[PDB]
């Protein structure tokens, strides 16, 4: 089993600080290249910071969840003539959303 597992891939990541075959941990990308997860955490932290800095008088309506395709179907529906999920007769989505909502209105 051990010799059966032994045919596995060995690391090609070495260091001159960790010497003697370090396994690797990675090159640690920054907060412009480590998102799609830290992006969401960064948005969440920023929203919490703004709500603290105001006093709870700000009230985000969760401009994330729903994701994209559901949102895209909703804005396709407002152009048909039937009402959307926030209007009826990332936080920058509100600015994009108002502009495409008033069209179908």
């Amino acid at each position: 089993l051990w010799e059966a597992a032994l045919t596995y891939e060995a690391s090609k990541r070495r260091c001159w600080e960790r010497v003697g075959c370090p396994p690797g941990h990675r090159e640690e990308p920054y907060l412009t290249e480590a998102g799609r997860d830290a992006f969401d955490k960064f948005c969440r932290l920023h929203q919490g910071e703004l709500q603290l800095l105001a006093g709870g008088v700000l009230q985000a309506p969760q401009p994330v969840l729903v994701k994209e395709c559901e949102l895209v179907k909703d804005v396709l529906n407002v152009l048909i003539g039937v009402v959307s999920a926030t209007f009826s007769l990332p936080e920058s989505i509100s600015s994009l959303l108002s502009e495409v909502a008033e069209y179908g209105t």
């Binding site: 070495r14 260091c15 001159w16 010497v19 003697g20 075959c21």
Partner: protein, 176 residues
């Protein structure tokens, strides 16, 4: 340590292998981490780097009384012989990443052939400076050392000689 020497040997001396033009890569530093006689092994090794450092400055100043297109072929040839000195410095540090158990002597035997190249091309770089030769007769004085007697400097001078001929073949192609 076996990366620090690989820069002290290259172009970046350090405070353990401090540079002087009256003694290249001086090590005189007392070591509780090294044997008393290890300094002499280092002393024999440091001559190899001293030559390379002198060579790179000589190439660096171009482009005093030496001037012409002839030094714009000679120094370019002097880079090409140092090119297997760049690849063979790359190889050692590639080995040291996985196996750190490899001693000084591995560098010693592996780079033993360029402790034969270097003293015999050092006389070529000094020869053109002590008496000023920057004419078309640089080719003769490399052409009499191309006979050689030591095979590394016998094949190194061929590389430079071809480049000098290549510059001579443009004057004699416009003219003709």
């Amino acid at each position: 340590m076996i990366h620090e020497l690989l820069l002290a040997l290259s172009g970046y001396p350090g405070s353990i292998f401090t540079w002087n033009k009256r003694s290249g890569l001086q090590v005189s530093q007392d070591f509780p981490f090294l044997h008393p006689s290890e300094t002499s092994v280092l002393n024999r090794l440091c001559r190899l780097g001293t030559d390379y450092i002198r060579f790179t400055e000589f190439i660096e100043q171009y482009t005093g009384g030496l001037h012409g297109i002839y030094l714009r072929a000679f120094c370019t040839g002097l880079d090409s012989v140092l090119q297997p000195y760049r690849q063979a410095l790359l190889d050692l540090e590639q080995e040291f990443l996985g196996d750190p158990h490899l001693s000084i002597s591995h560098v010693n035997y592996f780079l033993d052939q360029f402790q034969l190249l270097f003293p015999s091309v050092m006389v070529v770089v000094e020869q053109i400076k002590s008496q000023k030769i920057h004419g078309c007769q640089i080719l003769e004085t490399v052409y009499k050392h191309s006979c050689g007697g030591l095979p590394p400097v016998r094949s190194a001078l061929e590389k430079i000689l071809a480049v000098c001929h290549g510059v001579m073949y443009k004057q004699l192609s416009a003219w003709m």
